[PDB]
Structures are given as structure tokens and as C-alpha cells.
Amino acid sequence: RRRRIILFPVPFQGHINPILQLANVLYSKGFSITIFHTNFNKPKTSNYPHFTFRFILDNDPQDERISNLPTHGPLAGMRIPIINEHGADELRRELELLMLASEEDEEVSCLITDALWYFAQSVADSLNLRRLVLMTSSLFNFHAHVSLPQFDELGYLDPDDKTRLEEQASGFPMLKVKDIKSAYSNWQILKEILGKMIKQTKASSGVIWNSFKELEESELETVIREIPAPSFLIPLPKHLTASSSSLLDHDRTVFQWLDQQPPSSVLYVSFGSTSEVDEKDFLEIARGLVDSKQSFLWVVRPGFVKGSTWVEPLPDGFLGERGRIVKWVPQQEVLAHGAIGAFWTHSGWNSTLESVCEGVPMIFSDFGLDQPLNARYMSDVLKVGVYLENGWERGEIANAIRRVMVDEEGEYIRQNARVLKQKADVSLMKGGSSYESLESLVSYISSLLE
Ligand SMILES: C=C1C[C@@]23CC[C@H]4[C@@](C)(CCC[C@@]4(C)C(=O)O[C@@H]4O[C@H](CO)[C@@H](O)[C@H](O)[C@H]4O)[C@@H]2CC[C@]1(O[C@@H]1O[C@H](CO)[C@@H](O)[C@H](O)[C@H]1O)C3
Ligand SMILES: O=c1ccn([C@@H]2O[C@H](COP(=O)(O)OP(=O)(O)O)[C@@H](O)[C@H]2O)c(=O)[nH]1
């Protein structure tokens, strides 16, 4: 292969997944692939015999700054600003080492990083290496991020202010103030990071968005205005599932059980790869699921319940005939199964986009960051689900599950989800927005060294 691309993901499930999907898409277009990855949260490299992995940044002896960080929960993500602040030298060494060891007939076309590795732009510039960015969150979120200075001066980022929570955001009517407070809160660390992420995204040679035009058409002018480099909208879950990059073992016994269910009769429930709840809320969710009277498959990741290894507070047999709890599944493959009628999601972008691409309507909860914005956009703009925007109460949970899955009143939501899937499929056909994005990305990358 004449042209190599180096990809560098952020080492969490929701960032590794789209990077490795992208890597596969690019591999199928004729590029050779090297993945730079931390030892921390590494995927199974034996699932990717066609990729070269190079492990960087936390090899032994480990950096004192990284070493003692926990491997789960809130503070595991501190690896991100820490690597941004201290990783440049190593990244440069690793890139050079690879460029120096390459064959005569092989060139490195570009580096593709997660947008959150904003430090990588200066490193790539210092080597005369083009950097492209993969955004793993939505165009709508980007629009909100660039609007932060307006939100700041309007008073929305003061958490002591608890007025106007249910009002539309001034100059940004698609959101309510409470959505902005949940997304950004007071967090200075987030403000700093988003600021740098945005600045170095604008300075990059191109931006790949895990999305499609017909999903976020209202947000496209903002991106074209804010980012001078080309943007490419490719909905990665339509090209392939992220099964190979799973960091946990799959419970595939779920498929035998799904095969015993009537069509569209199962609620799939999963709150993603990093979320956690109090014991009280875990129990309220379980009761809502039971009260709904619908069959459900609930992925509860070990560590999801604060206080318990897995699901010890749950009484033995509490889920009845109708419910099953597992640790981890191949989520997109589950969402593609005929038994699934709805998806109760935490509104992480990969999960939301996967559900959209499989035509599965949603119930939304959120745990902050981009999640409330994704929930709001999907529930109010696209209208492909119901947003549980006021906590966990069994009655509310039960009503929402029933509305999406069974009520005649929710038929429009189910239909909206079916049609949105079809638009995703059409976008991949010749002349479609996604097809043209991918063709242009390949031509653009191939032109970078010329
Ligand atoms: C560099 C490129 C990336 C690029 C990717 C598609 C993308 C967009 C047009 C930006 C907006 C979103 C989106 C998704 C878009 O609306 O896509 C359009 O969606 C329509 C359906 O709604 C389709 O009918 C159109 O055909 C489609 O363009 C973007 C910028 C400029 C662009 O040019 C290309 O540069 C290439 C060289 O790298 C060159 O080979 C092509 O001739 C040239 O078109 C194209
Ligand atoms: O049982 C599960 C639960 C989640 N996922 C995958 O984990 C990723 C979660 O990413 P998301 O952006 O939805 O949320 P995060 O985990 O980053 O909060 C998605 O690709 C899911 O398909 C999975 O494979 N199996």
C-alpha cells in the first residue's frame, strides 16, 4: 500500500469505537493503517490483524501524573488534559520514529486524531505532517461549544442562578437553559479544554464528523462558517459496527433470548461505558422497567451502581419473565435485531447514532456533557424519542417506555425513527451526502502530499 494513515484515539470506548470504524473505512479504500494508542483501555489488537498498533504515552516506567489515576469513573478522564499538557515530546518522537522506519515506496499521508487531542496539531505542524480531526460528538454540540462565550455573558454558566431553567436559551432556541447547565455546569476545566479543542480543530487540515447531513442539517452552516478546512460527514455505524473494538467481553447469549421475543417487543436499556448511578436511582429505574410491563434487556456495566460490584441491591427474581440483565453486549447488533422496539439510552453520541442508523426510537436520560444536547435535539428537533428530563420516577419511566413502544400516540416517533434510518441509508448511495463525503475525504487525503 502506497499511503499510510496514522490514527490516534482517546482511550475510552466512545472514542475508540469511531476511530477504529473510521480506520476500517479508510483501510477498505486502500490505505495502510497504524493506530497509536495508550496501554490504558487498549482494544484487542488480535481483532485487527490488518492494522499496526504502536503503544505510546504510558509505557513502563509510567509517568507519575498518569500512574495513580483510577481506571474508572469521573477521574479516569483526567488522562486527557494530562496527555494534552505533557505528551507532545513523546508523540513527536513516535511519529518521527515511524516516518524514519517507513519503506521507500510508502508515505504517511496524514495523522487523524480525536479532536480532544488538541496538543497533536503543533506536533504534526512541527513535522510538516497534516492533521485531520475526528469529531466523536455531534455538529449540534459543536455549535453549542462555539456559543459558550454568549452563554457565559448571558449568565447560563453560573450554577447558583436557578432561574429560567425551563426557558429557551436566548439566541439558541433549540435548547432550554437547564440543558446548558447540565452540559457545561460551572466546569472551568471543560471550558479550557473545549476552547483549545475548538482552536486546534479550526487549525487542522480537515474535520471528519461521525454524522450525516440529513441528521443535523440545521448545524451545517455553523461548521462551514467556523472551520476553514473541509468537513466530511460520514455516519460510521452505517459502514460497520464497533464490535471489534469492544473493551469488555460480549454476552452473546442475549441473541437466543431475543430470538424468543415477538417483533418490536423488547426495550433495550444501556447507559453506556462510563456512567454511574446511586443505589436509590438504580432501584427506581428497575421499578420503572417492571411497571412498564414491557420485555427488556438491560445492560448494567459492572460499576454502574455506586456501592456495588454489579447488581447486588436488586432482589433475586425482581425482573420476572420479561427482563434480563447482562454486563455487556454487541450493542449495534442488538439494536439491529427484530425484537428491539425501543432504546432507553443515556444519549451518548455513538449510542444515539447507532439507534438512528438501526431505526430504533429512543427514551433519553442523560449524565451531562454532550448527552442533554443530544437528547434535546433528538427528542425536539428530529422527534425520534422521548426525553426523561426531570430525573428518575417509576411512573414517568413507565409512561415513556409505553409511549414509545406501544401507545398509538407514539406511532409518529416510531415512524420518525424508521424514516431517519432510511435517510441514513439513502445518504450512502451514489450522490448521497455521506457517499460524497467519503469520496471527497479519500481524494483529499490522497492529495495532501502533492
Ligand atoms: C472537500 C469537500 C468535502 C465535501 C463533502 C460533502 C460535504 C461538503 C459539501 C460540506 C457540507 C456537507 C457535505 C456532506 C455536503 O453537503 O455534501 C453534498 O451533499 C449533497 C446531498 O445533500 C450531494 O448532492 C453533493 O454532491 C455533496 O457535495 C464538503 C465540502 C466541499 C467538498 O468538495 C469536494 O472536494 C473534493 C476534493 O476533496 C472533490 O473531489 C469534489 O468534487 C468536491 O465536491 C465536498
Ligand atoms: O453493552 C454495550 C454498551 C455500549 N456499547 C458501545 O459503547 C459505545 C458507547 O458510546 P457512547 O458515545 O454511546 O457513550 P459513552 O460510553 O462514551 O458515554 C457505543 O459504541 C456502544 O455501541 C457496547 O458495545 N455494548
Side-chain angles (χ1 to χ4, degrees), residues 148-188:
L148 269 170
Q150 282 80 245
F151 299 161
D152 197 10
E153 71 182 312
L154 286 165
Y156 304 155
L157 309 180
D158 177 8
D160 297 327
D161 191 344
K162 303 175 79 78
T163 62
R164 310 179 294 162
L165 296 183
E166 282 288 312
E167 291 183 359
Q168 290 176 356
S170 181
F172 208 102
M174 287 183 165
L175 296 176
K176 302 184 182 161
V177 168
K178 71 195 269 187
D179 306 336
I180 293 170
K181 293 197 176 282
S182 179
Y184 301 108
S185 183
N186 212 169
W187 303 307
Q188 270 295 322

